Amino acid sequence: LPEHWTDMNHQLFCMVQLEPGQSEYNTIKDKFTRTCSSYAIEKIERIQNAFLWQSYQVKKRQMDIKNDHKNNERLLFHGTDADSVPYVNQHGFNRSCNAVSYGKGTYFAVDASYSAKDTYSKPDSNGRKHMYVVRVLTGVFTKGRAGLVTPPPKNPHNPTDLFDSVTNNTRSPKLFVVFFDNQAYPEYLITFTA
Amino acid sequence: NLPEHWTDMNHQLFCMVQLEPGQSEYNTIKDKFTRTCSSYAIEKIERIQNAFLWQSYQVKKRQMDIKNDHKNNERLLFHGTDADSVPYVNQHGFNRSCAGKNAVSYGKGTYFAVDASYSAKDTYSKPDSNGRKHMYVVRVLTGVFTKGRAGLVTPPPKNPHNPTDLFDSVTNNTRSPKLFVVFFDNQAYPEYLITFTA
Ligand SMILES: O=C1N=NC(=O)c2cc(OCC3CC3)ccc21
């Protein structure tokens, strides 16, 4: 389990509220405020989910072998409604659960501002919005298209050797779509307001 | 962590191994199959050695074994499919996003049968242009299960007031289970591919 995690008293799930002004809080706050400096942060919580982390690290080791190099991982944003937060904290991201123009997967934004739209981070009855900071195994990617259920093949002559993810634009990506469980680890939950 | 009876794959991550009749491994799968499908004949039985699917599956099994209270979480079940799906299942396993609607739906997931006779239906194991039918024998993490419902995209909660604490799978009938539905990747390991004909 990672260094920066705090002790869980032999439990396998904890949401840990970060201390404002310490290094970890400042790093995550800066990634958000790059594009969302007009929003008010109520809190940032570290997601310590041992089972999700295990399953994700296994996928990461496998993708590092398959792709014959590292650099398979990116930090991305995911806005969601308050009713989905408990599910994501416990079970992560489920493609089976908005527009799906680049395929039937889970969508992650490069910019917090994109995930901050009310259609994604729906304001709850008290006006609070929720956005995850997500470790995503984007790996080797191609342009997506409507109706994909998995990424395309890297060569139609080996139809089972797939891209790891798809994007809106391969030269200047602003979103990524992954199509498999455990390709995304929800690392921080930001609670914020307009 | 690959099983010690697998054949050497020489740094490769995937191998299909043809089993020999007379070996206990071939004969127990043949018996499991013929118990309900004695009218069909087996062409061959291949052991699926997929290092990546095995690792992800064994991680999910250890997690369910920890979470559940000394349960037998794992059953050996059947899955009939078309020849066009065999290369994908062999490499990537069972994808709920590719699943057909079942004639009796207990949820939107991947279906597994207790009896080979059910998977032997032409609806599931579609005969290819040479008349070969294909059925996987599958390690499935059924865990703790309940009767499913056609609307499900995940197993239901055990308790409505704790919506995130889920059953592991659903069935058609908890007293006499004949099918299981799983809603997550890496909850099933395709262990053997049976090729068979009328
Ligand atoms: O942050 C997000 N949370 N949920 C989404 O569905 C989502 C979707 C998304 O791109 C969808 C548009 C059609 C290409 C971007 C971000 C998010």
Q: Tell me how many residue pairs between chain A and chain B have CB atoms under 8 A apart.
A: 60
- Nearest CA, atom 8, ligand 1: A107
Which is nearest to B181 in space by CA: B118, B105, B116?
B105
Taking CA atoms, what residue in A is nearest to B55? A58
Q: Which DSSP helix (H) or strand (E) runs through A193?
A: strand A184-193
Which residues of chain B are at the A interface, by a Cβ-Cβ cutoff of 8 Å?
Answer: 13, 52, 55-56, 59-60, 63, 66, 87-88, 90-92, 95-98, 108, 153-154, 163-164, 166, 183-186
Chain CA centroid to CA A19, Å:
22
Chain CA centroid to CA A191, Å:
15
Q: Exposed, middle or buried, A123 (CB in 10 Å: 0-12/13-18/19+)?
A: middle
Taking CA atoms, what residue in B is nearest to A182? B185
- In degrees, rounded to 5, the angle at the alpha carbon of residue B176 between the alpha carbons of residues B172 and B180 is 40
DSSP string, B80-97: EE-GGGHHHHHHH---GG
Contact state of A59 with B63 under an 8 Å Cβ cutoff: no
Q: Which residues on A lie below 8 Å from B60 (Cβ)?
A: 55
Tokens in use for B2? 């690959």
Taking CA atoms, what residue in B is nearest to A183? B185
Q: Which DSSP helix (H) or strand (E) runs through A176?
A: strand A175-178
SS3 B173: coil
Among candidates A62, A97, A159 on the partner chain, residue whose Cβ is nearest the Cβ of B52: A62
DSSP string, A107-167: EEESSHHHHTSTTTS---TTS-EEEEEEEEE--SEEE--TT-SSPPBSSTTSTTSB-SEEE
Among candidates B13, B98, B185 on the partner chain, residue whose Cβ is nearest the Cβ of A149: B98
Contact status, residue B161 vs residue B102, Cβ threshold 8 Å:
no
Cα(A43)–Cα(B145) distance, integer angstroms:
37
Instruction: Please tell me the distance between residue A151's alpha carbon and the centre of ligand 1 in angstroms.
Output: 17
* Residue B65: Cβ within 10 Å count: 15
Distances (CA, A) of B71 to A131, B139, B145: 37, 15, 11
Cα(A142)–Cα(A14) distance, integer angstroms:
35
Contact status, residue A166 vs residue A144, Cβ threshold 8 Å:
yes
Which ligand 1 atom minimizes the distance to the CA of A101?
A: 13
Instruction: Please tell me the distance between residue A132's alpha carbon and the centre of ligand 1 in angstroms.
Output: 12
Q: Is B160 left (phi over 0), alpha (psi -120 to 50) or beta?
A: alpha
* Stated length of chain B: 198
What Å resolution does this PDB entry report?
1.9
Cα(A133)–Cα(A117) distance, integer angstroms:
15
Tokens in use for B155? 């197993």
Instruction: Please tell me the distance between residue A106's alpha carbon and the centre of ligand 1 in angstroms.
Output: 8
Which DSSP letter does residue B71 get? -
Contacts (Cβ under 8 Å, ≥6 apart) of A73: A60, A135, A136, A137, A138
Contact status, residue A151 vs residue A179, Cβ threshold 8 Å:
yes
Contact status, residue A121 vs residue A130, Cβ threshold 8 Å:
yes
Cα(A98)–Cα(A173) distance, integer angstroms:
19
Contacts (Cβ under 8 Å, ≥6 apart) of B38: none
SS3 B152: coil
Contact state of A179 with B97 under an 8 Å Cβ cutoff: yes
* E strand spans, chain B: 14-18, 41-50, 74-81, 110-113, 133-141, 145-147, 169-171, 179-182, 188-197
Contact status, residue A179 vs residue A105, Cβ threshold 8 Å:
yes
Distances (CA, A) of A83 to A184, B3, B5: 19, 42, 47
Which is nearest to A171 in space by CA: A128, A134, A127, A141?
A141
Question: What backbone phi and psi angles, to 5 degrees, belong to A5?
Answer: -65, 150
Which DSSP letter does residue B7 get? P
Cα(B156)–Cα(B167) distance, integer angstroms:
6
Cα(A38)–Cα(B76) distance, integer angstroms:
55
Question: What backbone phi and psi angles, to 5 degrees, belong to B83?
Answer: -60, -35
Cα(B135)–Cα(B158) distance, integer angstroms:
32
Sign of CA dihedral B142, B143, B147, B151: negative
Sign of CA dihedral B144, B70, A93, B84: negative
* Residue showing tokens 């207990």: B106
Furthest CA-CA distance within chain A: 54
Q: Which amino acid is at B102?
A: N
